[PDB]
Amino acid sequence: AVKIRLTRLGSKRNPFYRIVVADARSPRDGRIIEQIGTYNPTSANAPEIKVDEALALKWLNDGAKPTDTVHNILSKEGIMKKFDEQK
Amino acid sequence: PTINQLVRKPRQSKIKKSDSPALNKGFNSKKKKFTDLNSPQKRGVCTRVGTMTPKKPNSALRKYARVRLSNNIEINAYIPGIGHNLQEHSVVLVRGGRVKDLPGVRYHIVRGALDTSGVDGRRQGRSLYGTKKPK
Amino acid sequence: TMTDPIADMLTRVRNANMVRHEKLELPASNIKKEIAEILKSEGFIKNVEYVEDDKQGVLRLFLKYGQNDERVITGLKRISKPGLRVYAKASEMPKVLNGLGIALVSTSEGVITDKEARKRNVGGEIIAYVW
Amino acid sequence: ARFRGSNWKKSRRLGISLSGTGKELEKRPYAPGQHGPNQRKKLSEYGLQLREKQKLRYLYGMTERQFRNTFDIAGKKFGVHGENFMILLASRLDAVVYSLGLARTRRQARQLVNHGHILVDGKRVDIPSYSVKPGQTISVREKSQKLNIIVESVEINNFVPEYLNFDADSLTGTFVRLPERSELPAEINEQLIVEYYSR
Amino acid sequence: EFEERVVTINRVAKVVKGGRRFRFTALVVVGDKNGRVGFGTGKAQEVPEAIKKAVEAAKKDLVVVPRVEGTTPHTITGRYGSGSVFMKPAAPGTGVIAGGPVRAVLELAGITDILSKSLGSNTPINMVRATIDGLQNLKNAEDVAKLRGKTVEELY
Amino acid sequence: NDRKVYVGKVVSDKMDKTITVLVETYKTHKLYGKRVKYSKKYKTHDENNSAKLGDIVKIQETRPLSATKRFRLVEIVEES
RNA sequence: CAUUAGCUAGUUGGUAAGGUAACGGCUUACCAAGGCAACGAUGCAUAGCCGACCUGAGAGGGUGAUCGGCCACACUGGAAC
RNA sequence: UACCUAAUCAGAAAGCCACGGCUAACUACGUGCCAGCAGCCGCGGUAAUACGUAGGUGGCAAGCGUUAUCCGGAAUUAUUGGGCGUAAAGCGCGCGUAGGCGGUUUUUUAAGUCUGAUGUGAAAGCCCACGGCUCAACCGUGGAGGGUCAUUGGAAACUGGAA
């Protein structure tokens, strides 16, 4: 179904990722629905992550299901926490 | 013309007829059909090796070769350089470029290529005319 | 037959200016009246006289020449023609001779020049080039 | 070093002294070659445009398609195209090192940058074409601070251009200012290379 | 001092009973690189003397070229016969983007930044005449404001 | 939402419950810029065929009716 | 491309019925003769389309490799589960 | 495996094309309208800077030339931006249909025209700025730009519609 996942945007051995809401059947670097934020795992020390809040909580309420590491990224901003608070 | 005449009859530019037509055509042996390819070079078989008299202002015996290319096309090609080892049934590589004097020769045989030796005594200009670096 | 009365007006000015006639007359029109008064305010011609006859009154134009009989008007060019009309936005208003000449533009604010037309930020029909 | 050739024959074919400040055009100020000693013919427009381009290219030791690439970057910047082009050449790391006074010429300064004796901003920058920005620090590698060649030229350099603050102690530079047309080489007509590339 | 540039040297002929009396004609443009340029031609029996006549011919008639910071005040197209030269003023750092005989004429005047194109015959003499024609039709802001009874600021 | 509306002229009423409406509009030339008149014929439905050849009528689109018609007759304003 | 001028007969409209996720000649009967076309019907040849790429001062001209969106195809041709 | 640190060696690391004018670079020898060169102008017929070679020169350089195809130069389809007396071009001449264009004033409308506001013109691309790879290529961010676009106000001189 609808998945919040990462799209590779990096060169050889220098990956950059966008946090994107996309259909599961779509290709990894192909068709998408919405861009949510970015994820850079090769920055200085801590991997710098950028996430929007309004759209991210909008898609989660609509049934979008984060992958294993988008869950981590949404947790480091407390997004999964505030999603849990609104039961 | 007037603008209305231009609207009804838009301007028509002239078509460009390209030299070396036999390099622009391919062949399909399965369908027995001619195609469009735009090849840099074509490979053929020498069906006749001889010498041609040049145009009237000039006077020199020029070597040439009747080449049937990969297509079913029979063209005449120049042989640059001094000495050549080509007789009948010699596979050659033919590029573009015509000879001004020779009427009916619109191509050049590439020296130093498949079954075509270079110029024996060439020492400056070895990229053209074939032949490797002496010593 | 007559198709562009305005192009006739500019050609009348062009032909009279070439032989340095001091004055000319042409059948008047509201738009041809405004063009004359634009050229007066911009300093291309000396005076505009509009005479009331019964039918299509007469527009008398007094041309201006300089010290050494230097024709003040150098050229006239109709831009918008009946066979092909020209309209311009306020952003792409042309600069005749880098501002050394005026372009007559008919906008919603009346027949005006190209300089202050960019001031009102309005566009219209590019009537003619005067330099 | 790309050229690696005779720096006199180039300055003899050209009209400027390139590197050496006069030592090359003293006994034979004419062109090199068999026909050098005899009289020189006149130069056409193209010959003069090409000559001036070769003057500035061989002065900095750069090759074409990198001289041209740098020229392309210059046109992007605001101002005169010719001025920003020569400013950018004066901002090259290999040229800044020589103009700082660390080496005694252009080619040697290149081998100092190339072999990694510079450590721009404290970090090894071994690219001769690095573009130095105002407000940087061109130091010398600690293990290379006891180089006889470096210290042989640190005192004979004397004049340092105003857009470069040079410290004789600690072997450091600053690049305080953007060079103006005045500080740039005055033997080069910038307007003649701009016209060459527009041809 | 007026710097001179030889534009072209042409060997002409007059057929006589003996045959082909050959002469030489020289086209020379003179200028001062300050806004005074002129052209002239002269025919002699030898090349070096045809230049001197052309130089003297050119120094007589000089055209004052108005200019603002080495560029023309505005855009103009000079015409003479089949020759036509379009001339667009350019930015301070542009340079002289001109062709053949047009390039010499503008360089010998105080023009250093222009965009131009020869929209006509490439015959050198008519190219020069066309180039000069545009330079005399040129108008500066001061004259235009004076002619229209307005201030320079009122024009803009 | 809103379905598009066109105003044209009746050029054919030889079929029952169907008329042909000629909606003439203007299209400028891409290169030369002159506006050229071009016309498009629309086949419209009218259960009570009160439209007669020569009437200017009001046309609004709808779901596909028959192989060609996609429009219905909204308003008839001329008499001719 | 006009040295391709007249093209169609479910064709074009209507009335019923059927069946389609759904409107609809989509199909079938019966009515009427209709419908498109020099604003290029039809026919022939060529071609995947686009974002985009090359060139040019611009207007334009050429192109549709790699990357992304859409389409179509899976030895050739039919069919359904 | 990047990468860094120690020793060691100038040692293992340049060729291609041009040099008659366009078009930067000229001499000598061999040949003698031959052999050959050539994109065009053209060269070569015992004293070729045009052929082959040798020196020198010049242009680039891990590349250099040739060929194939596109745009430019070509204003040589001219909308920007061409013409038709003699260079190519006014139909042999009327009557006329579609179409194209159309005299002056007033009122109205608002299709064109102009000026806003929304929605969209995906992303990646071009340009600008900024940041990260030692620089650059490259990468990533932020703008910009891109439509005969759709909806909806406002203006009414011009073109269009009505009186």
mmCIF file of C-alpha atoms (C1' of nucleotides) in Angstrom, chain B residues 1 4 6 11-13 18-20 23-24 38-40 58-63 78 80-82 95-96 98-101 122-129 133, chain H residues 15-19 33-44 51-56 64-71 77-79 82-84 99-100:
data_model
loop_
_atom_site.group_PDB
_atom_site.id
_atom_site.type_symbol
_atom_site.label_atom_id
_atom_site.label_comp_id
_atom_site.label_asym_id
_atom_site.label_seq_id
_atom_site.Cartn_x
_atom_site.Cartn_y
_atom_site.Cartn_z
ATOM 1 C CA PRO B 1 4.867 38.256 -49.144
ATOM 2 C CA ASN B 4 -1.902 36.573 -44.914
ATOM 3 C CA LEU B 6 2.542 33.668 -45.289
ATOM 4 C CA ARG B 11 7.852 29.446 -45.838
ATOM 5 C CA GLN B 12 9.442 26.264 -47.189
ATOM 6 C CA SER B 13 13.180 25.854 -46.704
ATOM 7 C CA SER B 18 24.211 15.176 -48.615
ATOM 8 C CA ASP B 19 27.399 14.002 -50.279
ATOM 9 C CA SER B 20 28.549 10.374 -49.915
ATOM 10 C CA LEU B 23 27.413 5.812 -46.361
ATOM 11 C CA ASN B 24 23.843 6.771 -45.385
ATOM 12 C CA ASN B 38 24.348 7.305 -41.417
ATOM 13 C CA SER B 39 27.589 5.357 -41.029
ATOM 14 C CA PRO B 40 30.980 7.038 -40.537
ATOM 15 C CA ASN B 58 45.595 18.297 -64.201
ATOM 16 C CA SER B 59 47.615 15.340 -65.490
ATOM 17 C CA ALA B 60 48.591 12.382 -63.292
ATOM 18 C CA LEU B 61 47.724 8.691 -63.221
ATOM 19 C CA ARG B 62 45.502 8.247 -60.148
ATOM 20 C CA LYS B 63 44.880 4.845 -58.579
ATOM 21 C CA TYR B 78 40.390 6.724 -54.181
ATOM 22 C CA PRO B 80 45.660 7.828 -51.065
ATOM 23 C CA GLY B 81 49.393 7.391 -50.740
ATOM 24 C CA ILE B 82 52.156 6.040 -52.944
ATOM 25 C CA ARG B 95 35.288 6.761 -45.813
ATOM 26 C CA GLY B 96 33.811 9.946 -47.250
ATOM 27 C CA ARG B 98 35.569 13.029 -53.029
ATOM 28 C CA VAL B 99 38.399 13.633 -55.498
ATOM 29 C CA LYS B 100 37.947 16.859 -57.442
ATOM 30 C CA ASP B 101 39.769 15.771 -60.603
ATOM 31 C CA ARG B 122 55.672 7.889 -44.571
ATOM 32 C CA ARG B 123 57.274 9.673 -41.610
ATOM 33 C CA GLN B 124 55.233 12.868 -41.086
ATOM 34 C CA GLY B 125 51.469 12.543 -41.377
ATOM 35 C CA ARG B 126 51.205 8.905 -40.290
ATOM 36 C CA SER B 127 47.731 9.400 -38.817
ATOM 37 C CA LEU B 128 46.571 9.711 -42.389
ATOM 38 C CA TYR B 129 48.048 7.321 -44.956
ATOM 39 C CA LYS B 133 55.698 5.039 -35.619
ATOM 40 C "C1'" G H 15 52.388 12.228 -28.985
ATOM 41 C "C1'" C H 16 49.237 14.142 -33.079
ATOM 42 C "C1'" C H 17 48.399 17.676 -36.756
ATOM 43 C "C1'" A H 18 49.795 22.259 -39.526
ATOM 44 C "C1'" C H 19 53.354 25.901 -41.799
ATOM 45 C "C1'" C H 33 52.070 18.306 -65.096
ATOM 46 C "C1'" C H 34 55.600 12.235 -63.001
ATOM 47 C "C1'" A H 35 55.264 10.648 -58.323
ATOM 48 C "C1'" G H 36 51.770 12.765 -55.983
ATOM 49 C "C1'" C H 37 48.653 16.866 -52.810
ATOM 50 C "C1'" A H 38 43.907 19.187 -52.315
ATOM 51 C "C1'" G H 39 37.818 22.077 -48.234
ATOM 52 C "C1'" C H 40 37.864 26.148 -52.003
ATOM 53 C "C1'" C H 41 41.185 29.258 -54.651
ATOM 54 C "C1'" G H 42 44.331 25.443 -56.922
ATOM 55 C "C1'" C H 43 50.028 23.164 -56.850
ATOM 56 C "C1'" G H 44 53.388 19.785 -59.446
ATOM 57 C "C1'" C H 51 54.224 17.106 -53.669
ATOM 58 C "C1'" G H 52 58.113 13.287 -50.225
ATOM 59 C "C1'" U H 53 61.863 13.872 -46.730
ATOM 60 C "C1'" A H 54 65.291 16.707 -43.017
ATOM 61 C "C1'" G H 55 65.729 20.892 -39.689
ATOM 62 C "C1'" G H 56 62.920 24.804 -37.584
ATOM 63 C "C1'" C H 64 45.710 14.702 -31.787
ATOM 64 C "C1'" G H 65 43.504 14.304 -36.851
ATOM 65 C "C1'" U H 66 39.950 12.066 -40.572
ATOM 66 C "C1'" U H 67 35.231 10.446 -41.661
ATOM 67 C "C1'" A H 68 29.648 10.346 -40.645
ATOM 68 C "C1'" U H 69 25.291 13.674 -39.015
ATOM 69 C "C1'" C H 70 22.847 18.531 -36.817
ATOM 70 C "C1'" C H 71 22.753 24.001 -35.833
ATOM 71 C "C1'" U H 77 12.441 30.910 -46.986
ATOM 72 C "C1'" A H 78 13.990 37.356 -44.784
ATOM 73 C "C1'" U H 79 7.875 37.190 -38.391
ATOM 74 C "C1'" G H 82 14.691 39.511 -48.728
ATOM 75 C "C1'" G H 83 12.614 40.616 -53.231
ATOM 76 C "C1'" C H 84 9.720 40.606 -58.655
ATOM 77 C "C1'" G H 99 -11.336 34.543 -47.329
ATOM 78 C "C1'" G H 100 -8.209 38.804 -45.818
#
